[PDB]
Design an enzyme around this catalytic site. Sequence first.
Site, PDB file in Angstrom:
ATOM      1  N   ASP A 139       0.830  -1.184   0.000  1.00 30.03           N
ATOM      2  CA  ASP A 139       0.000   0.000   0.000  1.00 30.03           C
ATOM      3  C   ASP A 139       0.880   1.256   0.000  1.00 30.03           C
ATOM      4  OD1 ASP A 139      -2.465   1.287   0.096  1.00 30.03           O
ATOM      5  OD2 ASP A 139      -2.365   1.467   2.277  1.00 30.03           O
ATOM      6  N   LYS A 142       1.886   2.519  -6.356  1.00 29.31           N
ATOM      7  CA  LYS A 142       1.511   1.529  -7.369  1.00 29.31           C
ATOM      8  C   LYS A 142       2.675   0.972  -8.223  1.00 29.31           C
ATOM      9  CE  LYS A 142      -0.013   5.271 -10.467  1.00 29.31           C
ATOM     10  NZ  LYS A 142       0.544   5.140 -11.841  1.00 29.31           N
ATOM     11  N   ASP A 167      -3.392  -3.225  -1.658  1.00 26.54           N
ATOM     12  CA  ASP A 167      -4.462  -2.251  -1.719  1.00 26.54           C
ATOM     13  C   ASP A 167      -4.469  -1.610  -3.113  1.00 26.54           C
ATOM     14  OD1 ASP A 167      -6.677  -0.723  -0.830  1.00 26.54           O
ATOM     15  OD2 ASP A 167      -5.392   0.928  -0.121  1.00 26.54           O
ATOM     16  N   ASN A 168      -5.617  -1.083  -3.521  1.00 27.77           N
ATOM     17  CA  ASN A 168      -5.706  -0.163  -4.691  1.00 27.77           C
ATOM     18  C   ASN A 168      -5.345  -0.805  -6.018  1.00 27.77           C
ATOM     19  OD1 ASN A 168      -4.171   1.941  -2.385  1.00 27.77           O
ATOM     20  ND2 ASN A 168      -6.337   2.199  -3.005  1.00 27.77           N
ATOM     21  N   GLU A 197     -11.544   4.131  -0.172  1.00 23.64           N
ATOM     22  CA  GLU A 197     -11.772   4.691   1.144  1.00 23.64           C
ATOM     23  C   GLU A 197     -12.567   5.983   1.072  1.00 23.64           C
ATOM     24  OE1 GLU A 197      -8.652   3.688   0.078  1.00 23.64           O
ATOM     25  OE2 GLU A 197      -7.288   5.399  -0.023  1.00 23.64           O
TER      26      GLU A 197
END
Length: 213
Positions: A139, A142, A167-168, A197
Amino acid sequence: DTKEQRILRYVQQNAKPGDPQSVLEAIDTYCTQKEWAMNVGDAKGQIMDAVIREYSPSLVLELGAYCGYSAVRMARLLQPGARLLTMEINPDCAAITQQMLNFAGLQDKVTILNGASQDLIPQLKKKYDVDTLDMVFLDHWKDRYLPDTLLLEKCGLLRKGTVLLADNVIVPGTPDFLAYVRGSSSFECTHYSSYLEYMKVVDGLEKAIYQGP
Ligand SMILES: Nc1ncnc2c1ncn2[C@@H]1O[C@H](CSCC[C@H](N)C(=O)O)[C@@H](O)[C@H]1O
Ligand SMILES: O=c1[nH]cnc2c(O)cc(-c3ccc(F)cc3)cc12
Ligand SMILES: [Mg+2]
């Protein structure tokens, strides 16, 4: 006065010392009512909670600490004696995360490492006494997800069953990482669709379990 200092001060003034649950609720209220921030959030946090309860990891590595939200979140579910190591490139954030953990009373379970993940991962075995990891929460940024996964493998830090949770993977999105772990016979992957979020925007987490060389 930065946003990150305002989040910390809000927790300090609206949460109970030593109660990690009240800390998480104050961050979620601040970021819903006052200023959005890139904490994993309650929607995705509930999925993280479920995964942590399943595997009960003894040693977790988090890449990207920010304000300490996910560190409190994971650390409050770790077993007595289990440890989290969190890597944070920005020293202001490192310092906010340390104070967040101190206030939640979780500081004895967490060590915040200052620096780029790509510089610290190669130091884990010798400088930090790590054998292998039970779980990794990715996290940070990227573009680092795939190169840091490959670096963790190279450094011998992954074992059979090591759980990578990213995440993401949808927003901002990690296309190379996803194509890689999903096409690789070294990972068993599962997608957990959810929401960015504090927003009505689809995101998700990827679970990739390492299967060996
Ligand atoms: N290469 C790198 N190494 C370590 N930290 C990094 C990094 N690139 C970005 N970061 C950090 O990763 C963070 C992204 S936000 C992290 C959110 C946190 N895991 C939570 O849910 O509460 C930022 O604090 C940023 O400073
Ligand atoms: O860069 C990020 N690192 C770690 N987590 C993030 C995260 O959860 C969300 C976002 C993000 C998402 C949408 C947007 F419009 C702007 C930023 C970034 C990061
Ligand atoms: Mg994130």
